Design a protein around this nucleic acid. Structure first.
Lengths: 171, 63, 159, 51, 185, 192, 57
RNA sequence: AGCGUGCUACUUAUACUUCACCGUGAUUGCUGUUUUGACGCUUUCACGAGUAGGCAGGCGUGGAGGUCAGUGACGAAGCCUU
RNA sequence: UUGCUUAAUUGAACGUGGACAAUUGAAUGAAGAGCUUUUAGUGGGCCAUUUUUGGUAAGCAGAACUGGCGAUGCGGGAUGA
RNA sequence: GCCUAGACCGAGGACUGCGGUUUUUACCUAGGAUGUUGGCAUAAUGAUCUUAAGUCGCCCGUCUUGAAACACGGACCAAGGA
């Protein structure tokens, strides 16, 4: 979807026994803040004895990209459910924003593994600072020096239905 | 030759809720049917003397 | 064929509780029931006299009659599209006082007690019960409780 | 005989809400707020970036 | 599409005009329609509705019932209002002096009322001497003493009267009415 | 108007001060909700149907104001697969009341075209103007019940721009039913 | 056929007092005296002409 | 122009919103201006699927009482007819 | 008050007299509530989700809850209770 | 807050009301359309019938859970017919 990265902070409801419960933070990639709080509870209940009724949302904030105009390589650790079982994969993506690499990943797992948004957990999104940290060849080929490539067979979209001249595909 | 539907409760709650379900009307004095006779026998005399006492008190206030 | 006897389907309902068979503790026989009292009906399997029918096991009613060893209980039963007035004779072993009144009776006393205090003080006091309201605003201190970042964990087989 | 929208008809709006005129006069809908220029998130709230 | 919480286009279930085509009854309805509309007296609205009632819903009010009503505390000089026929009761030992407004009087009832020094007026004359029902006392006849009501709600263990043509030892008295012939209900 | 502005600025200042002092300001849970029935009248189970009748939502695109408590939250939870609800803002409430506001006068739907209509039915509750009614609705007041039951259920139109691709699924899953918590305002603007 | 009745009056009621007070017409900003115009209809359609005055009609 | 996924716009039900009209039910008021229709007029609001079935208001046919001092061989009734 | 009950002047039941007013004691809603008479048709059902029995299974036979079709047109599923 | 383009409609029928401007017992955009211009009245307009085009439309009655049915009655018309 058109996602954003959110800081969601929550805790168990204070009790006379426990008047200052521990605060828990997560980074959630959700289209909006309603899904952001919903996804937050979905993961605490997978890890802690807490519920939306017995808990409390403390803060929901957008984490904007630090350098939206810098090209980065993100490595993403996933855990998705297939038609047979549960698998972990690690995949790499090239983009300027952290959300955009996640958005590409959701499109990529839908296209290559038929994995839906509900079937995917993002364990970690990491910036690969060094060129040695990049493992996948489909993104290393864009890290070569003085990279040049043409775009053969350019197709021009026409406004008119009929064209009086022969087509060409030069570029 | 005529094996048919033996029984069903289908559609029975719909008919039960068209005009029902009506809770019974409550009154101040429930009927004393089924109450023990020994209590009910004495209760007759208690009520009789009770009204007599109230009558004599009210009778003095008029004359 | 079909069997629809009096105690059909009462295999577990009329059982005594685990490690609770034997004789009845005598607080059962010492409780005093008055006409108009509200009682929970729970059949005791060890006493077969004055035993309620399986429908009334778990019902609550009004005491309308007091006898030598039993009380008359009023139960409303749905029969078709209306309620039918039922009168069941129950030995006191199958009858317990319902605790719903003693909670409400205290609220009657408390409401009366609180209203005279405000009248004595000349102010107005509101005695209606209120449902749980949405919680108000608050400030969470992070001193000693800095948030810890949690993430979903990788899949793993534990067998 | 005919309902008129106060959000379109100005006379009906002034009839129902006499304060609307005042709301227009002081330009309350475009009121400038005077406040300091401070960044109160420079400290532990930068915990938003990483934790 | 509407989710109806109640049955639609349900009539009120009450009479808004007399089923009778009597022209003179329509004149009384005309007079009390104006009164119930222009006076705000609850007496006027009650009389207007009683003018709509059917014959079985206007039982005769005997001259003994009026005598009992005139013997209430402070009601001796009230105007007795009877929307219906006032019948005689030869079981009375005496009838007091009072004014009674009725739709109809029987010959015996009117004879007794006038002979004791009272007045027997129609309902139109009531509006002239009591347009707001001042110092009035509406009396209604017994409705459930009708013979048809005896058979209403007949069933086992009800105590009502069975619908029957003949009365005797051979007519509906053996089985279900006697334990010597099986059961009794 | 002054107290609305003061409340908004106070909340903003509280958030800023909490951000300054290494704390987290937890906003107060909303007291009012706007509920719009987005599902038709066919094939409804009896319990949600009774719930929807008790909310005065007997048609599609009908809106109602509900004060949030435990009882009302559990009522709305049963009707969730058929309604879209959320926390309404002051401007949304004002637009709703001005354009589609009708009162229940002697069981009749009467347009709130003058302050006399509102006074004749809510003067015993100290509601003298349409702004008094809007204030009572927005900040849930002591006479919220009478003011809200005075209002006839709002009859909205279909959204300009439509719904999402599929309505009858939760808003979290890409539908329209359920709680959207601030997007009820965009939906109402589409719908009012 | 049902004959007409006495209460079937024949008078024409007076019209209600309307509130349609006219207000002055507003022209386009591109319409200024001296502007060359093109006629689209009438006998002289397609002609180029000179705009001189805005009449009160 | 297939499959998985996302977005923007667009298309249209006897559905929703506004308006008109018809009917039903309720409702406002109407007699010193009631004024030859009060079984009438009038205001307002809501509602309108339907077999079996119930009820209401109406249309038509043969004859009877009353009335139109009704039509008619200068053409009744019947029949044919964008 | 009683003939019931208590060893009793104890209780039981029903009462007289007095105090506590709209926050009269949770929420929401209420084209209002209650009552009565009388009579029609019907008493072959079927389908979908979900629970479920027999059966290899069945557009099979039998149940539970709800909603529908029957009794229902309209937009979509090309076509279809 | 402001400017701006288009479409559909005009119910009602002396006055009464709520407001606003008040330069005013006056006026208004404020309890529902008026003003003006041209044309026509041998006609512009409206309706019906026949036909063409587009789109939709299975043969009615009946028993039936289910009928257009490869289920039954029905060639047609008049009069009689429960």
């Amino acid at each position: 979807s058109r996602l954003n990265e959110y800081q969601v902070i929550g805790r168990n409801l204070p009790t006379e026994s426990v008047p200052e419960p521990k605060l828990f933070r997560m980074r959630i990639f959700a289209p909006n803040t309603v899904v952001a709080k919903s996804r937050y509870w979905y993961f605490l209940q997978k890890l802690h004895k807490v519920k939306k009724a017995s808990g409390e949302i403390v803060s929901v904030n957008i984490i904007s990209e630090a350098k939206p105009t810098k090209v980065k390589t993100f490595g993403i650790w996933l855990r998705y459910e297939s038609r047979s079982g549960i698998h972990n994969m690690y995949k790499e993506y090239r983009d300027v924003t952290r959300v955009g690499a996640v958005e590409t990943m959701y499109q990529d797992l839908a296209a290559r593994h038929r994995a839906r948004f509900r079937s995917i957990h993002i364990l970690k999104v990491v910036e690969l600072e060094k060129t040695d940290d990049v493992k996948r060849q489909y993104v290393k080929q864009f890290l070569t020096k003085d990279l040049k490539f043409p775009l053969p067979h350019r197709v021009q979209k026409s406004k008119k239905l009929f064209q009086a001249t022969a087509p060409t595909t030069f570029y | 030759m005529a094996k048919s539907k033996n029984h069903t409760a289908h559609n029975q709650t719909r008919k039960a809720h068209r005009n029902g379900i009506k809770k019974p009307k409550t009154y101040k004095y429930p009927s004393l049917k089924g109450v023990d006779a020994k209590f009910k026998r004495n209760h007759r005399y208690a009520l009789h003397g009770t009204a007599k006492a109230l009558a004599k008190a009210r009778a003095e206030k008029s004359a | 064929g079909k069997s629809r006897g009096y105690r059909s389907g009462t295999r577990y309902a009329f059982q005594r509780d685990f490690k609770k068979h034997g004789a009845i503790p005598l607080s059962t026989y010492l409780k005093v029931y008055k006409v108009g009292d509200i009682v929970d009906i729970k059949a005791n399997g060890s006493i077969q006299k004055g035993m309620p029918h399986k429908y009334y096991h778990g019902k609550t009613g009004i005491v309308y009659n007091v006898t030598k060893s039993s009380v008359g209980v009023i139960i409303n039963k749905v029969v078709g599209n209306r309620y039918i007035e039922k009168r069941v004779n129950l030995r006191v072993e199958h009858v317990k006082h319902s605790a719903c009144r003693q909670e409400f009776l205290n609220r009657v006393k408390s409401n009366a007690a609180k209203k005279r205090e405000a009248k004595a003080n000349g102010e107005t006091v509101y005695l209606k019960r209120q449902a749980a309201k949405p919680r108000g605003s608050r400030i969470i201190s992070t001193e000693g409780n800095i948030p810890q970042t949690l993430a979903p964990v990788a899949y793993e087989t534990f067998i | 005989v005919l309902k008129k929208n106060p959000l379109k008809n100005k006379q009906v709006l002034l009839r129902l809400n006499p304060y609307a005129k005042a709301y227009a006069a002081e330009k309350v809908g475009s009121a400038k707020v005077e406040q300091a220029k401070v960044k109160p998130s420079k400290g532990q709230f930068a915990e938003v970036l990483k934790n | 599409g509407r989710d109806h919480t109640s049955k639609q286009h349900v009539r009120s279930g009450h009479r808004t005009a007399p089923k009778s085509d009597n022209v003179y009854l329509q004149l009384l309805v005309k007079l009390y329609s104006f009164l119930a509309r222009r006076t705000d007296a609850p007496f006027n609205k009650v009389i207007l509705k009683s003018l709509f009632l059917s014959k079985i819903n206007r039982p005769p009010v005997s001259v003994s019932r009026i005598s009992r009503a005139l013997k209430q505390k402070g009601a001796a000089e009230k105007t007795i209002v009877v929307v219906g026929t006032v019948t005689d009761d030869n079981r009375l030992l005496e009838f007091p002096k009072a004014t009674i407004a009725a739709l109809r009087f029987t010959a015996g009832a009117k004879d007794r009322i006038l002979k004791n020094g009272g007045e027997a007026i129609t309902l139109d004359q009531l509006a002239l001497r009591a347009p707001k029902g001042q110092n009035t006392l509406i009396v209604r006849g017994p409705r459930n003493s009708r013979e048809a009501v005896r058979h209403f709600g007949f069933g086992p263990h009800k105590g009502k009267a069975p619908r029957i043509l003949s009365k005797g030892r051979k007519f509906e008295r053996a089985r279900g009415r006697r334990r010597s012939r099986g059961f009794k209900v | 108007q002054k107290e609305y502005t003061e409340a908004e600025r106070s909340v903003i200042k509280a958030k800023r001060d909490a951000k300054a002092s290494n704390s987290y300001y937890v906003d107060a849970q909303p007291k009012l909700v706007f509920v719009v029935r987005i599902k038709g009248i066919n094939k409804i189970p009896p319990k949600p149907r009774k719930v929807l009748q008790l909310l005065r939502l007997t048609q599609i695109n009908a809106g109602v104001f509900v004060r949030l408590t435990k009882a009302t939250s559990e009522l709305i939870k049963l009707a969730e697969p058929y309604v879209a609800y959320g926390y309404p803002s002051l401007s949304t409430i004002r637009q709703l009341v001005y354009k589609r506001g009708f009162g229940k006068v002697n069981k009749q739907r009467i347009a709130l075209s003058d302050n006399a209509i509102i006074e004749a039915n809510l003067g015993k509750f100290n509601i003298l103007s349409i702004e008094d009614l809007i204030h009572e609705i927005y900040t849930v007041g002591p006479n919220f019940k009478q003011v809200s039951n005075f209002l006839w259920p709002f009859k909205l139109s279909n959204p300009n721009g439509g719904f999402r691709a599929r309505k009858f699924q939760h808003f979290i899953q890409g539908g329209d039913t359920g709680n959207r918590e601030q997007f009820i305002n965009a939906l109402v603007k589409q719908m009012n | 056929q049902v004959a007409p009745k006495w209460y079937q009056s024949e008078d024409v009621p007076a019209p209600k007092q309307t509130r349609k007070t006219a207000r002055p017409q507003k022209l386009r900003a591109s319409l200024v005296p001296g502007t060359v115009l093109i006629l689209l209809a009438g006998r002289f359609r397609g002609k180029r002409v000179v705009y001189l005055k805005n009449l009160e009609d």
